[PDB]
Amino acid sequence: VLHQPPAMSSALGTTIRLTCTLRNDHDIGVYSVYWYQQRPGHPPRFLLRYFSQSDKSQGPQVPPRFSGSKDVARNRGYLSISELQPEDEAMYYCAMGARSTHVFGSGTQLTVLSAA
Numbered sequence: 001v002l003h004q005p006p007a008m009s010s011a012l013g014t015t016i017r018l019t020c021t022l023r024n025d026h027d028i029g030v031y032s033v034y035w036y037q038q039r040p041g042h043p044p045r046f047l048l049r050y051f052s053q054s055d056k057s058q059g060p061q062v063p064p065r066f067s068g069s070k071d072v073a074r075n076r077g078y079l080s081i082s083e084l085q086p087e088d089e090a091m092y093y094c095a096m097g098a099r100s101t102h103v104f105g106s107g108t109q110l111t112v113l114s115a116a
Contacts, residue, residue: 001026002094002105011116015082018108020094022075033068033077034095034102037088044093050077084112 003021010016018035022028032051036044046059050068058064069078077096081088089112094105 001103002096004092004094004105004108006106007109007111009111009113010084011113012084012086014084014116015080016084016110017069018079018081018092018094018110020077020079020105022077022096024075026075027072028070028075028077029072031077031096032098033070035066035068035079036093036095036104038091038093038107047079047092081110086112088112 001023003023005019008016008018020033032049034049035047037047038044047062047066048059048068049057050070056068065082067080069080070076077094079092089110091107091109093107095102097103
């Protein structure tokens with residue numbers, strides 16, 4: 001139901017956009033997209049919930065360089081991370097539903113490269 005690419009890489013200081021793709025006889029225009037970061041040996045950490053530019057919630061202490069968006073026509077939810085830092089290297093999960101249920105995507109492993 002939720003596709004995420006297995007792995008993405010980007011260099012220090014850049015901006016990357018992770019995609020979470022509602023496949024696809026459901027409408028992303030009616031769901032909040034939840035995003036979580038997970039580092040090995042640690043629990044998931046809530047980053048942000050994104051429904052629209054006027055209906056979103058940033059997680060506690062998550063800097064604004066983590067931001068949500070959507071492409072509704074493509075059934076996609078996005079997590080953008082600007083000014084990538086070495087500690088952003090982690091697993092990123094999207095999730096949908098409010099529970100009731102919370103279905104997770106398979107997660108994108110993000111590698112932050114020392115050099116582009």
